[PDB]
Structure formats: structure tokens, C-alpha cells
Amino acid sequence: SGFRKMAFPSGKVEGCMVQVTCGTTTLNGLWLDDVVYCPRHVICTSEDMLNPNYEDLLIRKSNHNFLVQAGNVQLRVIGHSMQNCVLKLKVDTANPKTPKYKFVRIQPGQTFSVLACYNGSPSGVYQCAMRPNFTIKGSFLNGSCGSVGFNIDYDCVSFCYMHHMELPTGVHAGTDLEGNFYGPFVDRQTAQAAGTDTTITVNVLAWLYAAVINGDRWFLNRFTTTLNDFNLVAMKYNYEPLTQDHVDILGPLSAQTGIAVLDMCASLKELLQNGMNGRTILGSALLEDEFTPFDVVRQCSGVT
Amino acid sequence: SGFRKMAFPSGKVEGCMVQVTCGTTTLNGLWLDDVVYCPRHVICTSEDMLNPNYEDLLIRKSNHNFLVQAGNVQLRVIGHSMQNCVLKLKVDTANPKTPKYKFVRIQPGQTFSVLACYNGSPSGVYQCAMRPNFTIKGSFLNGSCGSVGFNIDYDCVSFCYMHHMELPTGVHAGTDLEGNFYGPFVDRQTAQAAGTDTTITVNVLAWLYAAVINGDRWFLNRFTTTLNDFNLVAMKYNYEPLTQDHVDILGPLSAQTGIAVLDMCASLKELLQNGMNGRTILGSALLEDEFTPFDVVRQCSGVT
Ligand SMILES: OC[C@H]1CN(Cc2ccccc2)CCO1
Numbered sequence: 001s002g003f004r005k006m007a008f009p010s011g012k013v014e015g016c017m018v019q020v021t022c023g024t025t026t027l028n029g030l031w032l033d034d035v036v037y038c039p040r041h042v043i044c045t046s047e048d049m050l051n052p053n054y055e056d057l058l059i060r061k062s063n064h065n066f067l068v069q070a071g072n073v074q075l076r077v078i079g080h081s082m083q084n085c086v087l088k089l090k091v092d093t094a095n096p097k098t099p100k101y102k103f104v105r106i107q108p109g110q111t112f113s114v115l116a117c118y119n120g121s122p123s124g125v126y127q128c129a130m131r132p133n134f135t136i137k138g139s140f141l142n143g144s145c146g147s148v149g150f151n152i153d154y155d156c157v158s159f160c161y162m163h164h165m166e167l168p169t170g171v172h173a174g175t176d177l178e179g180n181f182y183g184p185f186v187d188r189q190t191a192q193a194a195g196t197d198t199t200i201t202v203n204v205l206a207w208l209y210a211a212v213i214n215g216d217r218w219f220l221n222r223f224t225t226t227l228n229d230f231n232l233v234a235m236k237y238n239y240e241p242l243t244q245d246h247v248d249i250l251g252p253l254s255a256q257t258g259i260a261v262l263d264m265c266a267s268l269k270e271l272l273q274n275g276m277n278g279r280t281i282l283g284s285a286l287l288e289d290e291f292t293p294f295d296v297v298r299q300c301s302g303v304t
Numbered sequence: 305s306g307f308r309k310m311a312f313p314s315g316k317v318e319g320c321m322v323q324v325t326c327g328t329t330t331l332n333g334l335w336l337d338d339v340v341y342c343p344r345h346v347i348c349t350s351e352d353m354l355n356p357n358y359e360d361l362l363i364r365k366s367n368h369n370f371l372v373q374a375g376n377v378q379l380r381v382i383g384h385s386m387q388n389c390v391l392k393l394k395v396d397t398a399n400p401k402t403p404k405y406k407f408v409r410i411q412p413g414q415t416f417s418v419l420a421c422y423n424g425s426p427s428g429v430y431q432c433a434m435r436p437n438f439t440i441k442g443s444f445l446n447g448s449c450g451s452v453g454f455n456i457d458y459d460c461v462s463f464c465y466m467h468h469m470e471l472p473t474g475v476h477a478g479t480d481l482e483g484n485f486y487g488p489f490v491d492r493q494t495a496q497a498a499g500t501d502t503t504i505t506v507n508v509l510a511w512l513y514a515a516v517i518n519g520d521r522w523f524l525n526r527f528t529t530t531l532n533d534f535n536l537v538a539m540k541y542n543y544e545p546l547t548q549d550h551v552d553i554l555g556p557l558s559a560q561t562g563i564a565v566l567d568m569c570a571s572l573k574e575l576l577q578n579g580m581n582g583r584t585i586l587g588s589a590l591l592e593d594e595f596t597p598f599d600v601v602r603q604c605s606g607v608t
């Protein structure tokens with residue numbers, strides 16, 4: 001019993017982290033097979049960052065300008081290319097610790113673990129969600145760029161995120177491993193405002209199921225509702241709309257607890273309208289939205 | 305910027321986890337050099353667990369009764385001994401992935417990462433505190449016993465916890481790596497009640513400092529207090545007493561933010577007395593006590 005915000009074991013990703021230096025900028029790279037992936041802004045002076053022309057900046061750069069260090073050994077760069085907002089540095093040595101991996105672009109609401117790194121060295125691991133506004137609420141200091149987000153299915157690391165940017169509001173923006181930003185953000189030091197940070201409704205419902213499973217039941221009410229009625233209340237409270245897709249995904253949690261999804265929706269509705277009245281659920285005073293239904297099933301079933 | 309509940313990178317500990325089977329009981333072992341450490345209750349039938357005599361149960365056990373598997377390879381057990389509530393199984397092979405390590409007994413309030421394992425396989429990592437009542441609020445299903453708690457100082461893993469028990473209240477109890485329980489708990493399926501789960505005051509103060517550092521300042525008040533006045537309020541709210549030792553440990557956070565410790569104490573006092581009035585601090589609706597001052601400095605400074 002018990003329910004924790006839990007990251008994937010990070011060992012398989014620790015084995016992939018390298019330091020990338022271009023001139024006076026150092027940040028993190030991901031070393032998979034004989035390619036090192038890093039944010040293209042590695043080539044920028046924080047002066048360049050105001051209005052960078054990356055193609056023009058790149059002309060000035062050779063393989064030998066990219067310094068790649070894995071532990072305290074230097075990798076030989078034998079090629080470099082730009083793909084969207086990432087550089088791929090071809091190195092002469094395949095990473096001997098390359099795990100099975102995929103690059104996936106996740107959807108808003110999906111959770112992943114971040115291995116926070118400085119100078120190619122891991123400092124910590126935490127669990128995130130891609131916010132509905134395509135930001136993440138990370139913990140990232142200068143030098144943390146190229147830190148990656150990932151899921152693990154058994155022995156396969158799915159890389160979903162690379163850290164690029166802190167917005168003036170101190171929330172975070174980055175790319176998939178093809179170098180495409182999540183949301184409308186660009187790798188430029190300019191005014192970039194995030195949209196509404198709404199709550200991931202399907203994730204809240206999953207975590208209410210996790211609470212019931214773990215004995216926290218005080219909030220279960222006598223009511224039910226409809227998707228349309230619930231969605232009216234959701235919108236009023238900056239909750240994302242619940243679809244029949246979300247209801248389907250919650251099916252297994254509904255099955256295990258015998259609480260119909262629409263009943264749990266009506267319980268959520270009363271919590272929104274009545275508040276927590278100073279009570280907690282799974283040791284939280286607010287409704288947690290950084291567990292997916294898959295996450296709740298995984299942790300409640302003990303998947304390795 | 306940003307502040308996350310962050311575990312240590314778990315790779316160094318993933319490399320230490322093995323499966324231990326005695327008869328029909330399987331749980332986790334820690335393989336360091338040529339010794340595998342596991343909970344002694346591995347030798348119990350859940351029938352034995354009601355009133356086990358471990359010394360008498362152990363007489364019935366030989367080296368060959370302990371089945372140790374690291375990946376899908378079996379280790380040869382060439383010796384076994386009981387030390388307090390753990391078994392040490394001597395194996396014929398030194399773990400080639402043994403990191404530099406120490407066994408430390410932590411104090412209540414100290415934080416550590418848990419690598420949750422089933423069948424010797426890692427499922428997740430999360431950050432804990434040893435509660436003032438010597439319990440932890442973990443996430444542990446059947447098969448998770450022998451999962452360990454640890455801190456990392458650069459390249460040295462300090463093992464502080466091994467999981468043994470869930471109390472009837474669904475909180476967790478375990479040992480240091482010498483097999484000595486934290487708190488008054490025993491490895492027996494009997495009524496064992498925890499004491500008061502009080503808040504770790506020094507940790508709350510550290511996390512209020514982390515909030516200020518990260519731009520959350522709405523709660524900073526115009527007041528100060530004394531250790532004695534603050535402690536009167538602390539006791540009333542099931543907060544642990546603050547000592548001059550705690551004030552000293554917060555010195556660096558006081559220095560960086562220019563907020564005297566006793567001023568931050570008076571801010572905490574008003575939050576206890578007035579509540580959060582529906583506001584959040586670092587995205588929490590309650591006062592977080594699972595970051596130490598050391599943790600706040602580490603994460604706010606980017607230690608690897
Ligand atoms: O009123 C309805 C809710 C959901 N929101 C949709 C939304 C979708 C994507 C990203 C941000 C926001 C708007 C604001 O509040």
C-alpha cells in the first residue's frame with residue numbers, strides 16, 4: 001500500500017548522458033549508438049540568443065568545435081547536422097551502454113521522468129507531466145539544457161523530451177528527440193507567454209481511483225453525473241474536457257474499484273464545488289494531475 | 305528555476321538489486337561485494353510471521369535453501385548469517401557493479417531515495433523522509449521487501465534503509481543495513497501502532513526558503529518570533545520543536561535570501577494560524593516537510 005510520485009529507474013539514461021561544449025557554452029547531450037543529441041542553442045553566446053540565425057551560426061562551426069566528453073574521456077566528432085532545434089553529433093564510438101530506445105512525441109497530460117544533469121552528470125530524477133499548454137514545471141538551473149524526459153516499457157527507453165528553455169514565468173519548454181518544440185515555443189530569448197495551465201482531468205480521476213484503492217475514501221459521494229454536465233463544471237474550474245476516450249482509459253480502475261467513471265466524475269465535481277474543507281487525499285491538499293491511468297495501474301500492480 | 309521532489313539517480317543501486325527466494329517466499333536483496341543483504345523474514349511462511357523464532361527457523365536452512373538470482377544468472381551461496389533483522393548471504397562472486405558505499409543509520413527528518421523493486425527488478429524511484437515516529441510513507445506492494453533507501457554523495461552510495469514491514473495503518477517500517485529497525489517495530493505480524501506523525505519543522509522552513517528562492521513570496525510576513533514562542537505554536541500544530549542546531553543548519557539559506565531564520569519562523573507561524581486561504585506554495589496546498597536544508601541547497605545549487 002501507499003501511493004508515491006515515482007520516477008522510472010534512471011540507470012539506462014544515466015548511461016547515455018555526455019557533456020557537450022561549443023566555445024564557452026557547456027550543456028548536456030544524449031549519446032545513443034554513435035550519435036550525440038543536444039539543443040542547437042549550444043552554438044549560441046547568450047548574446048546570439050536574442051535573435052539567433054542557427055543556419056548562419058552553424059556555418060562558423062566544424063566537427064572539432066563540438067567537444068563531447070563521456071565520463072572523463074573525449075569522443076571524436078566525425079559529423080554534425082541540425083534537425084529542427086537539436087544537433088546530432090556523429091561520433092566515432094557507439095555508446096556501449098545504449099539501451100533499446102524509441103523517440104516518441106507525447107501528448108499533453110502524458111507523464112515522464114526527467115534525469116536532471118549538469119556537465120553531463122546526473123543530479124536527480126523526478127516525474128513530470130506535459131501540461132495542456134505544452135510547458136512542463138521542471139527543476140532546471142543553467143547547465144541543465146539537454147537533460148531528457150523518458151518512459152520505460154520493461155527494457156525499452158522511450159525518449160519524449162529534451163530540455164531547451166525557461167520562459168520568463170519560470171516554466172520550462174523543450175523538444176522531442178526530433179528537435180520539434182512541444183507547443184508554440186522557439187529557442188530564442190524573447191517574450192514567450194504560455195496559455196492557460198489547466199488541470200489534466202483524466203489524471204485527477206486516475207489519482208482519485210489510486211486514493212480509493214489505498215483506503216482514502218472520505219470524498220466518495222452519493223452522486224453521479226453525465227460527461228456533458230461534468231464538462232460544464234470542468235471548464236468553469238480550468239479542467240480539461242473529459243472525452244469518452246478518457247472514460248475508456250479509466251475502465252480498468254473503474255472495474256477494480258467498482259466505482260463507475262461517471263460516479264467518480266460526480267465526486268470530483270463536488271470536490272471542485274465544495275473544496276477539500278482542510279482534508280487531504282493521499283497526503284495532498286490539492287487534486288494531483290501528474291499520474292496517468294497507466295501510471296496508477298503500473299504502481300498499484302507493481303510492474304518492473 | 306522550479307523546485308521538484310527529486311530522487312538521486314538510481315543507476316548505482318539498480319546494479320545492486322538481486323532476487324532472494326527461500327522456499328515459496330521471494331523478495332529483494334542488495335548485492336554489495338560478495339554479500340547479499342535481505343530481510344530475515346525471507347525464511348518465514350506468512351504463518352511463521354505471526355510469532356516467528358528466527359534463530360529456530362534458521363536452523364532448518366542451509367546455504368542451498370537461499371536462491372539468489374542477479375538478472376537471469378544464479379549466484380552460489382557459500383555462507384549465511386543473521387545480523388539483527390537482516391540475513392547476510394555470502395556469495396562466491398563479488399558484484400562487479402558494487403559502487404563505493406557506506407551503511408548509515410539516519411535520524412528522523414532525514415530524506416532518502418527508495419528504489420522500489422519486485423523480484424530483484426527496479427519498478428520506480430521516489431524521495432522519502434524518515435518520519436519523527438520512525439515510519440516512512442512509502443509505496444510498497446507484496447514482493448517489495450528488501451527494497452532500499454539511499455543517499456549519494458558524488459560517487460558514494462550511503463544505504464540507510466531496507467524495507468521490511470507494512471503496519472496495519474499502511475505506513476512502512478524497516479531497518480538500517482545492520483538489520484536494526486528504525487523505531488520500536490519488529491518483523492512480526494502483530495498490532496504495531498505508530499506514534500504521532502508530527503511535521504518536520506526544519507524541513508518546512510528549508511522548503512519555505514526554496515519557495516522564496518524560486519519567486520513564491522506571498523507568505524513572507526512583517527513579523528519575527530523567538531525559538532520559545534515559535535516552539536509553543538509548533539507543539540500546538542504537531543510540528544517538531546526547532547533547536548538552535550536547526551537554526552544553524554538553515555544559516556546558508558538565511559544568508560542567500562536575507563531572511564533571518566526567526567523571521568521565516570514567524571511566517572510559518574502565521575501560515576499555521578491563518579492557513580493557506582486556498583493559495584499554494586511551490587504548487588503545494590500544504591506545507592512540505594520532505595526536503596532537508598541540505599536538499600534545498602543541493603537542488604538550488606545543481607550538485608551532481
Ligand atoms: O475553459 C476551458 C478550460 C480548458 N482550456 C482549454 C485549454 C486547452 C489547451 C491548452 C490550454 C487550455 C481553456 C481554459 O479552461
Ligand SMILES: OC[C@H]1CN(Cc2ccccc2)CCO1
Nearest residue numbers: 436437499500502539542543544
Ligand atoms: O506536541 C508536540 C508535538 C511533537 N511530538 C513529539 C514527537 C516526537 C517523536 C515522535 C513523535 C512525536 C509529540 C506530538 O506533537
